[PDB]
């Protein structure tokens, strides 16, 4: 919708549109930059903890660290769930640090009368709009419900599934910081039932992503004045509204629309170090979730769900559920269309300042830790040798680890048995660690010729580190034969 039309001006005595003309003056007085009243000044990041290596278990892990920024402008204000009650269309509120806080300071003057239009589909636009003449809370709320009973009673027939407006918002979490200013200072509240393993995250030992997902069934909103006065009752002075704190620290704002639905709060999690995690969860999410590829399957296999529903239910009813995360799809697909069993809570909504009618938008800026994680599984090396001859081998590999500062040391190792005589039937097994690359392999034998009296029969170099990679040499001195195979 388009905000609709202003109410008639109500009548009043020479003395009252005096002060009326006085509000006007003074709000219009107020200078202030309406792209720096609003923002949120997150962590600081003053330095990055430098890469490290160690080992754990039949594995080896390398956590790396990265500086990010999250800078970003929001027009649409969170609701915290527990006061939503309190976010209604034409509330009167300060703009200031408390609205960022996403529990705003309202206003507690007398009213005067406004418009409000509701976008629910097929209403003319003698429908969908109503007067109300003196905007309290209890007011506009029993205007909003005589305007979807309105729409009920008359276009819901023709209109059977209209599916809800989806405002979708997805993060990898790192920071409370961080997730305050993607998600509003509301997550705060939120994060008391999802309770984000931050700790866990910045050790490398998890990774989590924190979904918001909006099914807005409504929106109302409330018409544009063109005078400030004109939301204020007759009895309201300048001098009134200076000693209720509004001026140029704290400028005078409305809540220009409230959009009315069901939200879905998600924390995904896993212990995977997996780089594919988020496309992982992404497919689990969408119902693209292809069990074709194992990597993905495996990772959602082993990865749990945390949610939060508001406004899912009859009456104010939170629901909080626990689960896997194949068995997501399910909580997601209900509430995709609107019914009057359940009408839906303010979950959003947007302010603009009085002075001007201009948009109100906050603005978000956030330095974190971004911390990724590396898992390589140990591997062994299992020679067998058979051959009927005497038999040398020369195995060789690197291992990289990291000193304090995170710089790479690269140790060149040597397998003990390396350069001795081997009679058949001989076998032995060599334990690489994760962090071993560049596995080189050679064997000869000796042919005991006088022009040949050793015979290379492998030389294999730079391989890479397998779970098990068996060398097998055997044959006779004029024929040796061998077989380098993975896994088997
Ligand atoms: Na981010
Ligand atoms: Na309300
Ligand atoms: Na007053
Ligand atoms: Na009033
Ligand atoms: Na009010
Ligand atoms: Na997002
Ligand atoms: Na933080
Ligand atoms: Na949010
Ligand atoms: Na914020
Ligand atoms: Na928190
Ligand atoms: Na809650
Ligand atoms: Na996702
Ligand atoms: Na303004
Ligand atoms: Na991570
Ligand atoms: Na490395």
Known sequence: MA??????????????????????????????????????????????????????????????????????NNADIQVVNA??????????????????????????????????????????????????????????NNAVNTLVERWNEKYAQAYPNVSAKIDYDDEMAYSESQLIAKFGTAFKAVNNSLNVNFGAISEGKMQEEVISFKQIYYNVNVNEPTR?????????????????????????????????????????????????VKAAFDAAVSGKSVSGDVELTNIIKNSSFKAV???????????????????????????????????????????????????????????????????????????????????????????????????????????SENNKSKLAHFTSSIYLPGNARNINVYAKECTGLAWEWWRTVIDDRNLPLVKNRNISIWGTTLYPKYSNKVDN
């Open 3 to 72: 905000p609709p039309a202003s109410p008639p001006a109500s009548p009043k005595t020479p003395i009252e549109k005096k002060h009326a003309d006085e509000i006007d003056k003074y709000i219009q007085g107020l200078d202030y930059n309406k792209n720096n009243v609003l923002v949120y000044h997150g962590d600081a990041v003053t330095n990055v903890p430098p890469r490290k290596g160690y080992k754990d278990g039949n594995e080896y892990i390398v956590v790396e660290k990265k500086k990010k920024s999250i800078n970003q």
């Open 83 to 140: 006061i939503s009650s309190l976010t209604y269309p034409g509330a009167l509120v300060k703009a200031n640090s408390e609205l960022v806080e996403n529990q705003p300071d309202v206003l507690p003057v007398k009213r005067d009368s406004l418009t409000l239009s509701i976008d629910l589909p097929g209403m003319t636009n003698q429908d969908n709009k109503i007067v109300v003449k003196n905007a309290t809370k209890s007011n506009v």
């Open 228 to 276: 400030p006065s004109r939301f204020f009752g007759k009895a309201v002075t300048k001098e009134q509204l200076q000693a209720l704190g509004v001026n140029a620290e704290n400028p005078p704002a409305y809540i220009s629309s409230v959009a009315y639905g069901r939200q879905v709060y998600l924390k995904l999690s896993t212990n995977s170090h997996s780089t594919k």
């Open 309 to 415: 529903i508001y406004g899912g239910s009859a009456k104010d009813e939170v629901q909080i559920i626990d689960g896997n995360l194949g068995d997501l799809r399910d909580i997601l697909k209900k509430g995709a269309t609107f019914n009057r069993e359940t009408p839906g809570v303010p979950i959003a909504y947007t302010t603009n300042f009085l002075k001007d009618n201009e948009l109100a938008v906050i603005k978000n800026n956030s330095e974190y830790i971004e911390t990724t994680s590396k898992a390589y599984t140990d591997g062994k090396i299992n020679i067998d040798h058979s051959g009927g001859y005497v038999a040398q081998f020369n195995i060789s590999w690197d291992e990289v680890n990291y000193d304090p500062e995170g710089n790479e040391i690269v140790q060149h190792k040597n397998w």
